[PDB]
Design a protein around this ligand. Structure first.
Ligand SMILES: [Zn+2]
Ligand SMILES: [Zn+2]
Ligand SMILES: [Zn+2]
Lengths: 445, 93, 46, 293, 66
């Protein structure tokens, strides 16, 4: 959902703002890589010709088999307003945006760029020792403060404010603490590339009055920069933006020159495993991971018992699962984490069981489960235990003078989808507190 | 295998595992060298047809089935769906 | 030719044109065979 | 959908290009082709950030890899452009600088034959290396050949090209050919494109070459099945005779060496493998059609 | 079966490209003049239309006869 998320945000932006956004070649190049492969093919054809092509011609290129992909491509391009459909002389002519066409032309042909990609100071620093360590630690710190594990250096107010108001890491003053939510666990599950965009996308919505295009302009060219290089300093809004960028471990400053980091390059949709753990019948967890971040996330629903340098060993318990469920983590998410962080050995034995299953009877092909089904059943059963009681808040209706009135009132509540339960014998029905006013309003009417 | 291959005893192979069996099958794809004293040199008459691209389907002379495109024989103009095959009319490869 | 004429009158050109196209390659092939036979017969015989 | 590898086999040689300038009214047309290639490679890099580029130059006395440069710099391109683009273009132009100097020193050397076969074979080897080394990458070949120069003998070119066709087909590596020169069709290169799902294009004028490159030879391997190729010519997949040299529609081939012969070879012996045919059997072919007496 | 350049000419032409390359290189000049792009596009589509018609009709195929 990376290209979907970035693309969807661009669509919501008004066309008037999009035109100004396409001014810099850098952002146009980044936006070009987001469109579907067919869209890029048409765009490249149209960038280098200052003419008008009728719509039907582009359709002729697409084969009959790939006709479906044509509909998606044209729809995506039109929504971003990159392609301007002009109708005249009885034909629906097609043309490319003049600003976008010029922007792409300069980048490819090396025309005047107005320092969109930045400048080089020729003062490089060691990437492995400094850039990797700084961003890794800074990104590590924010993650720890999100998973709830104690950490000395808490994040700054800027990122702290962003996390709270967003769905991530819901906080309550009365509780006096911060805890993860259903979306928060998904955020942790998402790979680093999608993990970074979620925070950046939320920040883009947080900024107010700072221009929306300027923030988008800075973010796009940041990926264009190459790690381990200097870049001298930019818009006035981009200045405070650059300092705020340091809070997320994307750019490093000594105190005039800013250095992009691995995360900065990774932003622009760049193309045994650590975290693998063994889940077995005895509800014992053996995670072959050596990293506090992996340990912290595991503790959300695993009762850790001890840790070695090479791995951490723990046990799944009813208390541990309930703790995660209470916060808002769903069981389906938990199994996804277990399945996606499986040990290679588990797959082989599961495949061996499948091979024997096929040998005895090859007529059945069920989706293979890396971890034993018993763990799945118990975890889901515990979820059912927490959902044992279902309660709704609202009001009750009784003592209707006429049966027709009761039916009329009940029927309307069903129409507006606020009727929860009803009994014809007792002439009673219960409605949700949310739709209590609507039912009462209809009663008066 | 011996008397039929001019006394050579290397044409009778026994596998030792499934991996070797695939090698044995694969080795048979390559053409087998001919014997010196077994001479059968000659010239074989075959032609090179030209592919066509017609607007409407036409019956094929090999299967009597309607097919859009086919290769026209250079000796009798009959069309064949696929190659390489012996022409169904003039018996020319 | 008789089949084309039979289809022509029966279908009134609605199917004759399609019928001729389907059988065109075979009709040309047989005509070429006769043409080759006629052409060579003049040479060897005379 | 997935990264793709583009390998451009540019055939650069003063003899091929000088003849092009003399016949036409354009001087230094190699710059226009070279300039178009630089933008074309940048356009390919702009399609995706995970795609690589390779350029092989077939000079008079051999072949050389322009990009990536061997581990074993002048300013020709502005330094304000995108870093990745310049990282390739600057090396590409620099190698052209060195290659021309090397060719200039050996100008008096006798260039007996063209070396397009080696570059195409070399490109395929590079394609194989990247695919296995990195693991899930598509590949494509682009041949920029200048056919204006009157070739000496193209027969030697037939065998290497046909072998390359099979290798490209097996590896799913479509090869496209762009030809600039007098002759409209190349019986061998055009055959290569059709047999490998490639695009063959011929342009008489060097000016405005980018439009062709970006509109015809820009179909990435990811979307090849859904794009209809713009090729206009047709191929017969026929081969010339060994004695007459003409295209043979119906003829004879030796049973041992598979050498095409339009007519029965003189002396009743094969001219390629020195194999003697049976007098009776060859007489069978010589027999005339049966006609009533 | 259905002018040769002298040695000096190659050196002369090679020097011209040698000078044209070292002095400067302008990629922006690659863009057409808007008078040949229309001609280039017009002929390219001419093949597309023919190819599209050929490829739209590339077990037995459905027929119209009874
Ligand atoms: Zn057939
Ligand atoms: Zn035939
Ligand atoms: Zn022979």
């Amino acid at each position: 959902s990376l290209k979907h998320s970035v693309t969807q945000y661009l669509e919501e932006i008004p066309q008037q703002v999009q035109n100004r956004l396409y001014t810099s070649p850098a952002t146009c190049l980044a936006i070009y890589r987001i469109l579907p492969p067919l869209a890029k093919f048409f765009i490249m054809a149209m960038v280098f010709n200052e003419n008008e092509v009728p719509l039907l011609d582009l359709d002729k290129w697409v084969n009959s088999n790939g006709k479906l992909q044509f509909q998606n491509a044209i729809k995506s391009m039109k929504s971003l307003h990159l392609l301007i459909p002009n109708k005249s002389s009885g034909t629906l002519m097609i043309n490319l945006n003049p600003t976008f066409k010029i922007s792409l032309r300069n980048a490819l042909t090396g025309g005047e760029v107005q320092n969109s990609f930045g400048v080089v100071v020729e003062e490089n620093v060691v990437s492995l020792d400094l850039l990797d360590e700084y961003s890794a630690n800074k990104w590590e710190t924010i993650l720890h403060f999100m998973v709830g594990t104690p950490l000395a250096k808490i994040p700054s107010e800027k990122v702290l404010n962003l996390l709270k108001h967003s769905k991530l890491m819901e906080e309550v003053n009365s509780t006096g603490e911060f805890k993860i939510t259903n979306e928060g666990f998904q955020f942790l599950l998402q790979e680093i590339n999608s993990q970074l965009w979620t925070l950046l996308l939320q920040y883009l919505k947080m900024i107010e009055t700072m221009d929306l295009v300027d923030v988008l302009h800075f973010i796009f060219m940041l990926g264009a920069l190459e790690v381990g290089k200097a870049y001298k300093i930019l818009s006035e809004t981009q200045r405070i933006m650059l300092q705020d960028m340091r809070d997320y471990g994307l750019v490093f400053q000594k105190h005039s020159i800013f250095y992009p980091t691995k995360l900065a390059l990774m932003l622009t949709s760049d193309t045994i495993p650590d975290g693998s753990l063994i889940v077995e019948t005895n509800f014992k967890i053996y995670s072959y991971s050596n990293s506090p971040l992996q340990i912290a996330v595991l503790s959300l629903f695993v009762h850790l018992k001890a840790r070695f340098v090479n791995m951490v060993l723990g046990q799944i318990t009813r208390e541990s699962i309930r703790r995660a469920l209470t916060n808002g983590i769903t069981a389906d998410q938990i199994i996804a984490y277990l399945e996606t962080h499986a040990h290679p050995q588990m797959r082989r034995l599961a495949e061996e069981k499948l091979e024997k299953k096929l040998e005895l009877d090859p007529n059945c092909k069920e989706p293979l489960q890396v971890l034993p089904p018993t763990v799945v059943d118990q975890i889901r059963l515990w979820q059912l235990e927490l959902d044992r009681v279902i309660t709704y808040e609202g009001s009750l209706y009784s003592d209707f003078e006429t049966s027709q009135e009761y039916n009329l009132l009940s029927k309307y509540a069903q129409d507006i989808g606020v009727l929860l339960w009803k009994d014809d014998k007792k002439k009673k029905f219960f409605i949700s507190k949310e739709g209590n006013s609507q039912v009462l309003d209809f009663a008066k009417r | 295998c011996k008397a039929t291959n001019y006394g050579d005893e290397s044409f009778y192979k026994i596998l030792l595992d499934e991996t070797h069996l695939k090698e044995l099958f694969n080795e048979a794809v390559t053409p087998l060298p001919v014997n010196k004293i077994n001479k059968g040199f000659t010239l074989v008459k075959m032609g090179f047809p030209t592919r066509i691209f017609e607007d409407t389907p036409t019956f094929c002379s090999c299967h009597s089935k309607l097919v859009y495109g086919g290769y026209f024989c250079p000796n009798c103009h009959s069309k064949v769906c696929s190659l390489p095959t012996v022409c169904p009319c003039c018996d020319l490869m | 030719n008789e089949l084309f004429q039979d289809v022509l009158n029966g279908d009134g050109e609605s199917m004759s044109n399609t019928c001729t196209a389907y059988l065109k390659p075979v009709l040309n092939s047989i005509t070429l065979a006769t043409h080759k036979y006629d052409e060579y017969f003049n040479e060897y015989n005379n | 959908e997935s990264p793709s590898l583009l390998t451009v086999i540019i055939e650069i040689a003063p003899k091929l290009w000088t003849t092009f300038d003399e016949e036409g009214n354009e001087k230094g047309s190699i710059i226009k082709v070279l300039e178009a290639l630089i933008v074309f490679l940048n356009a390919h890099l702009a399609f995706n950030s995970a795609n690589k580029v390779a350029v092989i130059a077939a000079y008079s006395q051999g072949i050389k890899y322009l990009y990536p440069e061997s581990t074993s710099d002048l300013k020709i391109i502005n330094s304000d452009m995108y870093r990745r683009f310049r990282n390739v273009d600057e090396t590409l132009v620099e190698e052209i600088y060195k290659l021309f100097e090397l060719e200039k020193k050996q100008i008096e050397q006798n260039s007996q034959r063209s070396t397009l076969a080696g570059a195409m074979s070399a490109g395929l080897t590079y394609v194989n290396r990247i695919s296995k080394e990195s693991v899930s990458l598509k590949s494509r070949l682009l041949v920029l050949t200048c056919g204006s120069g009157s070739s000496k003998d193209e027969i030697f070119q037939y065998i290497p090209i046909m072998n390359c066709i099979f290798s490209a087909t097996k590896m799913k590596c479509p090869i496209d050919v762009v030809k600039i020169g007098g002759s409209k069709e190349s019986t061998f290169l055009q055959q290569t494109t059709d047999a490998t799902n490639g695009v063959y294009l011929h342009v008489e004028s060097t000016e405005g070459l980018i439009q062709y490159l970006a509109t015809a030879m820009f179909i990435d391997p990811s979307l090849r099945p859904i794009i209809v190729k713009p090729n206009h010519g047709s191929v017969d997949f026929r081969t010339s005779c060994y004695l007459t040299g003409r295209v043979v529609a119906v003829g004879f081939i030796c049973s041992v060496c598979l050498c095409v012969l339009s007519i029965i070879p003189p002396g009743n012996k094969c001219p390629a493998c020195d194999s003697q045919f049976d007098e009776h059997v060859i007489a069978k072919l010589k027999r005339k059609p049966v006609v009533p007496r | 079966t259905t002018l040769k350049v002298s040695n000096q000419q190659m050196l002369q032409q090679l020097s011209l490209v040698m000078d044209n390359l070292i002095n400067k290189l302008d990629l922006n000049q690659v863009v057409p003049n808007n008078e040949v792009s229309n001609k280039i596009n017009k002929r390219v589509i001419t093949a597309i239309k023919i190819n599209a018609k050929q490829a739209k009709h590339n077990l037995e195929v459905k027929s119209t006869l009874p």
